Design an enzyme around this catalytic site. Structure first.
Site, PDB file in Angstrom:
ATOM      1  N   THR A   1       5.337  -3.499   0.672  1.00 52.09           N
ATOM      2  CA  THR A   1       5.553  -2.036   1.309  1.00 52.09           C
ATOM      3  C   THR A   1       7.297  -2.070   0.958  1.00 52.09           C
ATOM      4  OG1 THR A   1       3.424  -0.933   1.736  1.00 52.09           O
ATOM      5  CG2 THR A   1       5.895  -0.260   2.715  1.00 52.09           C
TER       6      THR A   1
HETATM    7  B1  LIG Z   1       2.375  -1.362   2.053  1.00 55.49           B
HETATM    8  O1  LIG Z   1       2.215  -2.108   1.086  1.00 55.49           O
HETATM    9  O2  LIG Z   1       2.253  -1.945   3.071  1.00 55.49           O
HETATM   10  C1  LIG Z   1       1.224  -0.446   1.701  1.00 55.49           C
HETATM   11  C2  LIG Z   1       1.713   0.561   2.789  1.00 55.49           C
HETATM   12  C3  LIG Z   1       0.504   1.995   2.517  1.00 55.49           C
HETATM   13  C4  LIG Z   1       0.651   2.488   1.385  1.00 55.49           C
HETATM   14  C5  LIG Z   1       1.468   3.323   3.142  1.00 55.49           C
HETATM   15  N1  LIG Z   1       0.029  -0.848   2.118  1.00 55.49           N
HETATM   16  C6  LIG Z   1      -1.048  -0.837   1.388  1.00 55.49           C
HETATM   17  O3  LIG Z   1      -0.802  -1.575   0.006  1.00 55.49           O
HETATM   18  C7  LIG Z   1      -2.359  -1.326   1.551  1.00 55.49           C
HETATM   19  C8  LIG Z   1      -3.145  -0.938   1.178  1.00 55.49           C
HETATM   20  N2  LIG Z   1      -4.700  -1.081   2.159  1.00 55.49           N
HETATM   21  C9  LIG Z   1      -6.317  -0.526   1.023  1.00 55.49           C
HETATM   22  C10 LIG Z   1      -6.787  -2.107   1.510  1.00 55.49           C
HETATM   23  C11 LIG Z   1      -8.319  -2.555   1.302  1.00 55.49           C
HETATM   24  C12 LIG Z   1      -8.697  -1.383   0.211  1.00 55.49           C
HETATM   25  C13 LIG Z   1      -7.897   0.255  -0.403  1.00 55.49           C
HETATM   26  C14 LIG Z   1      -6.460  -0.237   0.037  1.00 55.49           C
HETATM   27  N3  LIG Z   1      -3.974  -0.416   2.655  1.00 55.49           N
HETATM   28  N4  LIG Z   1      -2.964  -0.643   2.899  1.00 55.49           N
END
Ligand SMILES: *[B]([O])([O])[C]([C][C]([C])[C])[N]C(=O)C1=[C]N([C]2[C][C][C][C][C]2)N=N1
Ligand SMILES: *[B]([O])([O])[C]([C][C]([C])[C])[N]C(=O)C1=[C]N([C]2[C][C][C][C][C]2)N=N1
Ligand SMILES: *[B]([O])([O])[C]([C][C]([C])[C])[N]C(=O)C1=[C]N([C]2[C][C][C][C][C]2)N=N1
Lengths: 212, 214, 204, 200, 202, 220, 196, 202, 196
Positions: H1
């Site tokens: 992210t």
């Molecule tokens: B980022 O990579 O930090 C992102 C921010 C989020 C989208 C606001 N986080 C994630 O990539 C992410 C993925 N997941 C889940 C993990 C278990 C399966 C469903 C998705 N949680 N955050």
């Protein structure tokens, strides 16, 4: 670090009075994926002996290679091929040599004895073994054993005349039990290899199974 | 090697009519960081053999030098005999199992592609010593994403052409760039035919992002 | 495993216009057998039987609480409970303890009231219904039972043909399991009769 | 596993069940838990199938070599001592085996119990296995030193039968052996199912 | 730790911080991380101080003896290969992140990267240490092919300064080194001479 | 388990396999994974079977109650919110990853709800253990504004990819077409697997099984 | 380890139990009573957790005695065994579950003698004879081989001696004395203790 | 992210990646991380997807109700304070890295940082996520006071692009947002439109 | 738990030990011998690890018997106790250390009776009386209160009975028989077993 991997696969072995059938599925897997759809677990040792292994494929590939070399060395010093019973007794000592880092293999040697009657030897991972009439080892060993007991051993039957196990009736039985193991076991499927050990050599038959 | 450091992702492999094609992205990842973005993960063993390794990159470099010496050593005798793709695969399987039995393995997953005596050979050796042959291979995350695509083309068309297999490899590389978080959009494409081993690249895929607007 | 503490196995098969429900009778704490006539199958209403497998304490508790609910249900809306309704009732009971569940895998078998259509099903510990058309097994030796039923069951068997199939499946499945056996009780539910016989099994 | 042994006036009686298990699953039901070292030496097995089989076979090879050098049959005390020293080297390594050596050497019938832990004691009535506790009950109850051969066969058969009825890891058939001064003989091999019909 | 090595036509430019921390305490605030392996061959050390010093001493010994037998200036690739051998051999016992950079008559100015595992890869510029994570985006957006020996010294000073502010394990002064065919030229950048970047303020 | 869904020209096409395993053993070769939430909203569910049923059964009754009150057609957002809020409240302990697809006043919407409570509104989604195999087909052949028949063929290929490459999925293929004017629940849609024919009979002739006791009871 | 045993006859139930209370390696008591008189024809034998046994056996007893006071008639052996099984099973998944194994013996006027066996997981099972403890392994086989359904009271006591004699020579624990009781149509009768 | 928010005279400029990974697999390759809390108030989400969505929904509800009672455009500081409250209250249960940025009539364009613990600090520009570690040195050396609404959009696009190449958890497209007094303007940067930096090659 | 005991008198040593060999909960032997005859006037009592006791006691015995063959005279009780202590202490930090507790009793012509106590950590200590096991806790106090240095052989056996009788009523283990021996100027004498 884990030095073992469950690759699945089931191997069957039925002994007759003139033959010996050794069958196995040809699906190699890991976890939920399929490695290859064409990987038979049957190996021709001599002209009257066939070995079938299941479990960790790495150990199967090594154990088989060791057995092949041990057979060649034995023929060099004794000037004759090793018999089914001598190949079973030698395998016991090889499996028990790695007693504290054992082969994750389930071996089922099937061939003909000195007399000329079918012989089947079942082995345990560490080396323990015994001669029986029929045997099933692998991921579907618990699914097939009970059926062979009832059908071939005539257990729990009050009104049966116990007809001799013919080579044509045993061929259908191996095909039938493996078609039921492919419906329940997720490690059994795609293809079934059948090796028939007779006095006229070793024959090989291939039948398709479910792919899902 | 108990814990890998700089590792590589999936390596693709598919046999075609008259050879074997192998693809691998050129990226050395250090955890989730794309540290080295220009490392070759494919090595040409000899005239009829090529190798693509995924996993620990240091282990791949050790195997690259241990294999290179072997090929050089055999060529010094000049007796006509040469290591075939099947003989190299066998040697690697014994080397991987031996290391794994000593509780100190080479963290790698190789894909051996060769072409000798009119036969295309596609081997696969993992770190545990598990080995087998197949018409199409895929390591790492390619077994869950690219393997299904390669297998869906070889079921209705068992025999492929050089151009067809190459066009299928590009489709798989493009799909791996959309779903694998440890992949780069820069990869190499090695092909082994009757003429020998040839490596091309770096190549890229044609990614489309129409779904981002919907 | 907690499920393999008392052993036992239940099986339900479907026939033409009949159903069969078999179970092992050995009650034992781990490797030691205590009694050889433990009840694992309970009558939920004439042509409706429920077989429970797993922890013996949960087998009795679940059978008693389901009976408690079944009695109130039949009194409230004065009618016989339907096979499919009982499954939902049992599934609901099991799902109440979703994070502290009962160790028992139920196997329901019976004929639909008035229509007399065969019905067999199985549920997991947290009440996950699974209605099949051939057979349903539950116990410590399901693998052995799965292999027997798969190659013995026939589409439209009669009461006598069905009894032979479910008996041969259980007798050969419990002989491969160590903590299962010591007698086999089979109930064949028909449209106008309920035959119950104990098979001659091995006392091992 | 359920194996018992007791020496009465007419030699030593050895009985054992024939059932191997792989957890809850019954691996086999025709396993031979009694191995013959020679014509006057018997050896029972309990615990690790591969452990007992490989080490008793190793003892049998040692007893044959011993007889070639000293031109005489090894004693029951020396045979057990040999095996005891073999398993002691791998003490606390995982070995699992509870054997009983029986034979008729110079000092009459001899019965020794040798386990992988380190024990090596002599006695008149032993019982190894997971069903040994149940076998002890019936054994002691009916045991008498002046038991007749036919009465001793009954006791040994009944003792293994009741142990297989109560223990889940014991079953199959009941192999009975009788060691005498002329050598051991295979008495019988009745099946437990047929014994149940006779005791009911 | 924040080491960095870049290369130009003539030779290469090295750079490192000087902080040695044992937890949240700076045991040595003026550590010299740039270690000479030979006349025109240097190496930046990162990771464990005891492990990098032991290996550098060993390589320096092996390279010196090898260069005396061959009667020729050692190759930078040879020095990097020696480092790689020990780094790979004892990868489960050592914690080093050596960056070999020097100049030889054959290939000129070269920069080699020998990370923890023991792999060896040649690059035009390399960064290592715990503080190199913060300047990954900066070097990718500022590096341009054709930089001279003067621009390389300003490029390295700028990147090291940016990593020293964000990393707690990096700080102190900046030790630079420009290796060409003429020789080696060391230079330290203290307080006022260290590149400064206006901290965003409201 | 392989469940998937796409958004075509004028509707939603959901699909799933019919195999249910209890470890490495097939317990049910014909279970339904596509659940009915409402007339215009359906749901594909993977993860914990028991939780997937109970969560969809509860949300469907809540949407039915809401529909009776408002007197209008339920929205896909409403079903999404209810599910995602309830799932988040159990802190991921309710293993229920479902694919929510339906058509309302705003059009056809496809969501993917994860056990923890996160949702994703995409044009195509895949869940289950064979999710990566089905995603490869969607990332290689999916095109926007596809025809009904084209979407049914593409979603069938996605389920087939998972069924033949994943050990946790098999049996048949279930489809569900939800459009602006129709709701086609095709079960089964395609049967790529069929048990082999018996090579011999093993019928148990009467009297083959001994009986120790026997008691018949005549019911009314 | 404590030892309990029950033998149900044609019209009587024979129960016995060791009377040894012990802390670590020493026997604190050699005449302890593990039998609880629930009613005029119901005995509850209890063994297990140090403090749980008495706490649980006295709670059941209180309720069984309460039942007779307000109703005028006593609870039957079956109902009393189901009541105790339901109470032990309710605490199983509670905050304070009693770890107790027990044997319920009783005589019902219109049902004869009853012998119930119960483990600590609240699994009730009617049996012709039963035992609890580490000594049950050694005596259960003796019972099986010599017990017949029509066994007389005199032979039931002779059979009991055999089991207790087996413990004397085979068991590793020290159990020199045993409490013996019998329940028939005339209530509970105290039998002479079997000492060794 | 990799989320980022910068501010200029008029208002603020937001930016984020679109990759959602569950291990080494991209579950969602076009995730919309920029969430509108109100008319002129947005927020970049980072950390746990389920935790950031739950909190954003809650804050959006509380802010909407608060703005309807006061009959006035909500303050950006008020939205940030609400976020901070829940982030601090449930700091041991949530995993979020929210960046509140909007525009209000009182203070203008503001950017607030609410990291994991639940602290709230106002900055001229903020970066968050796992891929923000690689661009820390870049933003410190490129950011200059006085940037216009056009330069801020190029500054954010450049930093996000640099973080997407080094981070495995960052990638896909780039979602930008420019909030001023006139309104909000969303914009996506796909393949060809994404800033590219020549990878160093020999 | 095994039990050993020794009582040294004016010109004799009295040693006794339980003869119970047991596996898990059952006694496999009720006439086991835990005493090893090292010489004509030296007895080595051994208890502890299942396999270690015999392996260690037989190794010492072999060496003590070897000493007499090549020298013509036997090792003294003190020297024999120091030799065994040195061997047990050498294995302590080795690959295979024997976990054995023992009591060495002997009679030296020019030194009288000797009683040595040794634990598993190879700490040698001469004592007038000693004991090993869990039963030592119960009998050590009885010894202390009744033992006098000039105690006669007849009273030494009477005192031994008291300790063994205490075990019968207090100990939780089952020790019905004990092996008794006495060493004086005429060698080792076998005394009638004390059975209960
Ligand atoms: B980022 O990579 O930090 C992102 C921010 C989020 C989208 C606001 N986080 C994630 O990539 C992410 C993925 N997941 C889940 C993990 C278990 C399966 C469903 C998705 N949680 N955050
Ligand atoms: B007995 O039950 O002890 C019996 C004696 C043997 C056959 C001489 N042993 C076994 O049945 C047995 C079980 N096992 C292993 C248990 C763990 C899995 C592999 C088999 N080995 N012997
Ligand atoms: B750097 O921070 O990585 C740096 C590189 C070294 C100087 C080559 N490492 C260290 O800071 C460092 C400190 N230490 C020891 C820790 C224990 C006390 C002595 C110093 N090791 N590396």
């Amino acid at each position: 670090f884990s030095p073992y991997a469950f690759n699945g696969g089931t191997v069957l072995a039925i002994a007759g009075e003139d033959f010996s059938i050794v069958a196995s599925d040809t699906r190699l897997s890991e976890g939920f994926s399929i490695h290859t759809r064409d990987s038979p677990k049957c190996y021709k040792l001599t002209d009257k002996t066939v070995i079938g292994c299941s479990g960790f494929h790495g150990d199967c590939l090594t154990l088989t290679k060791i057995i092949e070399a041990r057979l060649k060395m034995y023929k060099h010093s004794n000037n004759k091929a090793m018999t089914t019973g001598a190949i079973a007794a030698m395998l016991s000592t090889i499996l028990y040599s790695r007693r504290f880092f054992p082969y994750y293999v389930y071996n089922i040697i099937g061939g003909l004895d000195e007399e000329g009657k079918g012989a089947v030897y079942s082995f345990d991972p560490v080396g323990s073994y015994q001669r029986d009439s029929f045997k099933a080892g692998g991921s579907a060993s618990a699914m097939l054993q009970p059926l062979l007991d009832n059908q071939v051993g005539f257990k729990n039957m009050q009104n049966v005349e116990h007809v001799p196990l013919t080579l044509d009736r045993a061929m259908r039985l191996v095909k039938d039990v493996f078609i039921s193991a492919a419906e329940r076991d997720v490690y059994t499927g795609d293809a079934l290899r059948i090796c028939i050990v007779t006095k006229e050599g070793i024959r090989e038959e291939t039948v398709p199974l479910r792919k899902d | 090697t108990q814990n890998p450091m700089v590792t590589g992702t999936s390596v693709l492999g598919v046999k075609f009519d008259g050879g074997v094609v192998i693809a691998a992205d050129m990226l050395g990842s250090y955890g989730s960081l794309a540290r080295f973005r220009n490392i070759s993960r494919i090595m040409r063993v000899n005239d009829s053999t090529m190798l693509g390794a995924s996993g620990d990159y240091a282990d791949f470099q050790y195997l690259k030098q241990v294999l290179g010496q072997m090929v050089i050593d055999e060529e010094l005798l000049g007796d006509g005999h040469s290591y075939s793709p099947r003989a190299i695969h066998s040697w690697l399987t014994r080397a991987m199992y031996s290391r794994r039995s000593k509780m100190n393995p080479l963290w790698n997953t190789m894909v051996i592609g060769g072409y000798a005596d009119g036969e295309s050979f596609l081997g696969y050796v993992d770190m545990l010593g598990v080995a087998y042959e197949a018409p199409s291979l895929a390591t790492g995350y390619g077994a869950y994403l690219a393997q299904p695509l390669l297998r869906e083309v070889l079921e209705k068309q068992p025999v492929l052409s050089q151009t067809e297999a190459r066009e299928l490899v590009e489709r798989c590389m493009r799909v791996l760039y959309y779903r694998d978080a440890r992949s780069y959009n820069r990869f190499q494409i090695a092909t082994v035919t009757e003429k020998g081993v040839e490596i091309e690249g770096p190549l890229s895929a044609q990614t489309n992002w129409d779904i981002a607007h919907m | 495993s907690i499920m393999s503490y008392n052993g036992g196995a239940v099986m339900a098969m479907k026939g033409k216009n009949c159903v069969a429900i078999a179970a092992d009778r050995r009650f034992g704490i781990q490797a030691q057998m205590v009694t050889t006539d433990f009840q694992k199958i309970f009558p939920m209403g004439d042509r409706l039987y429920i077989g429970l497998a797993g922890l013996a304490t949960d087998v009795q508790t679940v059978a008693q609480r389901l009976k408690f609910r079944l009695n109130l249900y039949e009194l409230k809306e004065g009618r016989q409970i339907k096979p499919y309704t009982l499954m939902s009732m049992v599934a609901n009971l099991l799902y109440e303890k979703r994070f502290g569940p009962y160790y028992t895998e139920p196997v329901i078998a019976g004929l639909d009231p008035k229509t007399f259509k065969p019905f067999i099903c199985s549920l997991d510990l947290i009440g996950c219904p699974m209605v099949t058309d051939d057979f349903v097994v539950s116990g410590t030796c399901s693998e052995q039972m799965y292999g027997m039923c798969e190659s013995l069951w026939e589409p439209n068997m009669d009461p006598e043909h069905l009894f032979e199939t479910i008996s041969q499946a259980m007798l050969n499945a419990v002989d491969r399991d160590a903590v299962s056996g010591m007698g086999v009780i089979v109930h064949v539910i028909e449209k106008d009769k309920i035959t119950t016989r104990t098979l001659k099994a091995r006392m091992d | 596993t359920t194996t018992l042994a007791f020496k009465f006036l007419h030699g030593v009686i050895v009985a054992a069940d024939s059932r191997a298990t792989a957890g809850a699953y019954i691996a086999s039901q025709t396993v031979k838990k009694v191995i013959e070292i020679n014509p006057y030496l018997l050896g029972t097995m309990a615990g690790g199938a591969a452990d007992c089989s490989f080490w008793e076979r190793l003892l049998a090879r040692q007893c044959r070599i011993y007889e070639l050098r000293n031109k005489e049959r090894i004693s029951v005390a020396a045979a057990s001592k040999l095996l005891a020293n073999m398993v002691y080297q791998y003490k606390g390594m995982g070995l699992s085996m509870g054997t009983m050596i029986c034979g008729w050497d110079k000092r009459g019938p001899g019965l020794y119990y040798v386990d992988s832990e380190g024990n090596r004691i002599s006695g008149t009535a032993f019982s190894v296995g997971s069903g040994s506790v149940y076998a002890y009950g019936v054994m002691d109850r009916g045991y008498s030193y002046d038991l007749k051969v036919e009465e001793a066969y009954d006791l040994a058969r009944r003792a293994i039968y009741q142990a297989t009825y109560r223990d889940a890891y014991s079953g199959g058939a009941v192999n009975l052996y009788h060691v005498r001064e002329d050598g051991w003989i295979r008495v019988s091999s009745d099946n437990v199912a047929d014994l149940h019909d006779k005791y009911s | 730790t924040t080491i960095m090595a870049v290369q130009f036509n003539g030779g290469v430019v090295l750079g490192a911080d000087s902080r040695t921390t044992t937890g949240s305490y700076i045991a040595n605030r003026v550590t010299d991380k740039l270690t000479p392996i030979h006349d025109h061959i240097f190496c930046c050390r990162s990771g464990s101080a005891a492990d990098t010093q032991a290996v550098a001493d060993a390589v320096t010994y092996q390279l010196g003896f090898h260069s005396i037998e061959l009667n020729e200036p050692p190759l930078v690739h040879t020095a990097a290969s020696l480092f790689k051998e020990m780094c790979y051999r004892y990868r489960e016992d050592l914690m080093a992140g050596i960056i070999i950079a020097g100049w030889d008559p054959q290939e000129g100015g070269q920069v080699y990267s020998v990370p923890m595992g023991g792999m060896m890869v040649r690059q035009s510029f390399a960064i290592g240490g715990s503080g190199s994570s913060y300047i990954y985006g900066y070097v990718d957006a500022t590096y341009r092919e054709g930089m001279t020996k003067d621009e390389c010294l300003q490029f390295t000073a700028n990147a090291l300064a940016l990593a020293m502010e964000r990393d707690g394990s990096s700080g102190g002064v900046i030790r630079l080194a420009a290796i060409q065919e003429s020789g080696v030229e060391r230079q330290v950048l203290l307080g006022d001479q260290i590149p400064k970047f206006t901290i965003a303020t409201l | 388990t392989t469940i998937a869904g796409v958004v075509y020209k004028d509707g939603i096409v959901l699909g799933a396999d019919t195999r249910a395993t209890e470890g490495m053993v097939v317990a049910d070769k014909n279970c339904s994974k596509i659940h009915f939430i409402s007339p215009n909203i359906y749901c594909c569910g993977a993860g914990t079977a028991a939780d997937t049923d109970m969560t969809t059964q509860l949300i469907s009754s809540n949407l039915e109650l809401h529909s009776l009150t408002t007197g209008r057609l339920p929205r896909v957002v409403t079903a999404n919110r209810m599910l995602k809020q309830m799932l988040f409240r159990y802190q991921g302990y309710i293993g229920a990853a479902l694919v929510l697809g339906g058509v309302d006043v705003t059009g056809p919407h496809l969501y993917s709800i994860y056990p923890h409570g996160s949702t994703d509104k995409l044009p195509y989604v895949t869940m289950g253990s064979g999710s990566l195999a089905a995603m490869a087909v969607f990332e290689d052949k999916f095109r926007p504004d596809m025809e009904e028949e084209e979407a049914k063929k593409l979603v069938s290929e996605a389920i087939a990819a998972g069924i033949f490459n994943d050990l946790g999925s098999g049996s048949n293929i279930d489809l569900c077409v939800i459009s602006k004017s129709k709701l086609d629940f095709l079960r089964p849609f395609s049967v790529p697997n069929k048990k082999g024919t018996r090579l011999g009979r093993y019928r148990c002739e009467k009297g083959t099984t001994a009986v120790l006791t026997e008691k018949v009871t005549p019911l009314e | 380890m404590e030892y309990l045993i029950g033998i149900q006859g044609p019209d009587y139930v024979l129960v016995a139990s060791d009377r040894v209370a012990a802390s670590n390696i020493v026997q604190m008591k050699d005449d302890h009573d593990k039998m609880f008189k629930m009613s005029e024809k119901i005995l509850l034998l209890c063994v297990g957790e140090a403090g749980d046994t008495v706490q649980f056996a006295e709670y059941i007893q209180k309720n069984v005695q309460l039942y007779k006071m307000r109703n005028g008639y006593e609870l039957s052996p079956t109902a009393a065994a189901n009541f105790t099984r339901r109470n032990l099973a309710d605490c199983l998944r509670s905050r304070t579950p009693y770890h107790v194994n027990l044997l319920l013996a009783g005589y019902d006027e219109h049902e004869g003698p009853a012998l119930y066996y119960m483990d600590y997981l609240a699994a009730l099972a009617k049996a012709p004879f039963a035992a609890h403890g580490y000594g049950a392994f050694l005596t259960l086989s003796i019972l099986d081989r010599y017990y017949t359904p029509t066994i007389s009271r005199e032979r039931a006591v002779e059979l009991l001696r055999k089991c207790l004699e087996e413990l004397q020579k085979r068991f590793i624990l020290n159990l020199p004395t045993f409490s013996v009781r019998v329940i028939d149509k005339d209530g509970i009768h105290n039998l002479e203790n079997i000492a060794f």
